[PDB]
Amino acid sequence: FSTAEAAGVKVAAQDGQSPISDLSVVLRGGSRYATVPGVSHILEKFAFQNTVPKSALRFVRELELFGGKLYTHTTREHIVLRTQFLKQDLPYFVDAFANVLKETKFQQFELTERVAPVAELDLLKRESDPAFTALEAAHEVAFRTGLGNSVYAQGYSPVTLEDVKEFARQVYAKQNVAVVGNNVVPADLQQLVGTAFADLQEGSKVTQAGTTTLHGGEARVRTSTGNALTIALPIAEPKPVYHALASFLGGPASMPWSVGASPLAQATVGTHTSVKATYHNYGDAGLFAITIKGDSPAEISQVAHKAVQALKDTGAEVTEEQAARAYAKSKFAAAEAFENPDSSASVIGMELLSGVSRIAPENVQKFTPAELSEAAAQLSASAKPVVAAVGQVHALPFADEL
Amino acid sequence: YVKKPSYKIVPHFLGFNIPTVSKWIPIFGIWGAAAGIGALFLIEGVPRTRQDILSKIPIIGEHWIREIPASDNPF
């Protein structure tokens, strides 16, 4: 991805040999920057609504003629708007993004009838998985605000048209916008962005209201639709070793009809439960989480104990074999993330919008058994453990039990 | 490079356009035949229908040329 600048907008493109191009606008407008709860989700859903030059209806009918597709999502850091089309149709897509950022008519009926109902279905689909809920709850406990804001719009706190219009006034500005073009000729994209995004406001960098503060605690989301448990450990100094530790501890199987050779995978033997360790770097803080879902609260409780033990055991000693297995699983995870268009866009988006240089999968550091065990030791000896239980919460573990 | 999709709006009225209607033109034809045959069948008994239309059809037309003998007709 050759990083450049076109009319004040950071543009990164990588040419390829495929008939398919992906163009993504990455906006610094994720939920950590959200003025009011849920506004970044609503703004994401308000992309490709009526603009002054082109109605939502006309856009969709013309997109069907190009056979293009549209993908949008919100993270804690970004809003990502991606289009996938044939290479030759690049100018149309650039101009479409320009219309969205410059000329969206944010109309009250779109919010009531189109945008908010779709945002609500989006969230309900995600929450069907109790593990999603548990990991969301864990961020809320760990960070409270900023990273602790909900990503998604909720019913209890309604977003108004004035909320969304104000946020868009901040976000849709040259200072908060990065363009990422996969299989796009880099010189051609710079020329097009340079003409189309010239009259976009300059604006100012959106910032998190307040510094990131870490907290421990418990969340007990009582649902009737499945059971899950997250054990998170907030990290004050995000370090790349936690990727290796996440992949080492593992949890999912690398093979059909198997349990797996990872410590966390082996904690689920004899139970219909699954586990996944994940590490979330947010630049200024991190979260190391272990999420366990299952149908039995008794089995979840059983696995949860084994999971925290596994982490303690790792803090004791890692073998050389296990450290190499961690390097391999971690390099692979890095590679596939840079391939997947959704995650790819945000990776270069972070490089462009912040200044965090991307770590190429081929440059992923190999951590010795000493470095891995040291990282696990810090986590086992955390002052601020977070536990989010979802489901039959009376039957799930508590932080002080773990 | 393509800047714009290439299309036109065809003339339309009450949700009909010429491409669509043209597909149904033959069907209106057959319905018209069906209505014609049916109508003619319904009035086959009317003497004027026989006199003016049916008796004039070649070969077949003699089916409708029938005379009552003057000996058998009170009127």
Swiss-Prot record, chain A:
It holds the Pfam family Peptidase_M16_C. InterPro entries: Metalloenz_LuxS/M16, MPP/UQCRC_Complex, Pept_M16_N, Pept_M16_Zn_BS, Peptidase_M16_C. GO terms for molecular function: metal ion binding; metalloendopeptidase activity; ubiquinol-cytochrome-c reductase activity. One of its GO terms (biological process) is proteolysis. It is a peripheral membrane protein. SUPFAM superfamilies: LuxS/MPP-like metallohydrolase. It comes from the Eukaryota. Keywords: Electron transport, Membrane, Mitochondrion, Mitochondrion inner membrane, Respiratory chain, Transit peptide, Transport. Gene3D superfamilies: Metalloenzyme, LuxS/M16 peptidase-like. Component of the ubiquinol-cytochrome c oxidoreductase (cytochrome b-c1 complex, complex III, CIII), a multisubunit enzyme composed of 3 respiratory subunits cytochrome b, cytochrome c1 and Rieske protein, 2 core protein subunits, and additional low-molecular weight protein subunits. The complex exists as an obligatory dimer and forms supercomplexes (SCs) in the inner mitochondrial membrane with cytochrome c oxidase (complex IV, CIV). PANTHER family: CYTOCHROME B-C1 COMPLEX SUBUNIT 2, MITOCHONDRIAL (PTHR11851:SF209), METALLOPROTEASE (PTHR11851). Belongs to the peptidase M16 family. UQCRC2/QCR2 subfamily. This is Cytochrome b-c1 complex subunit 2, mitochondrial.
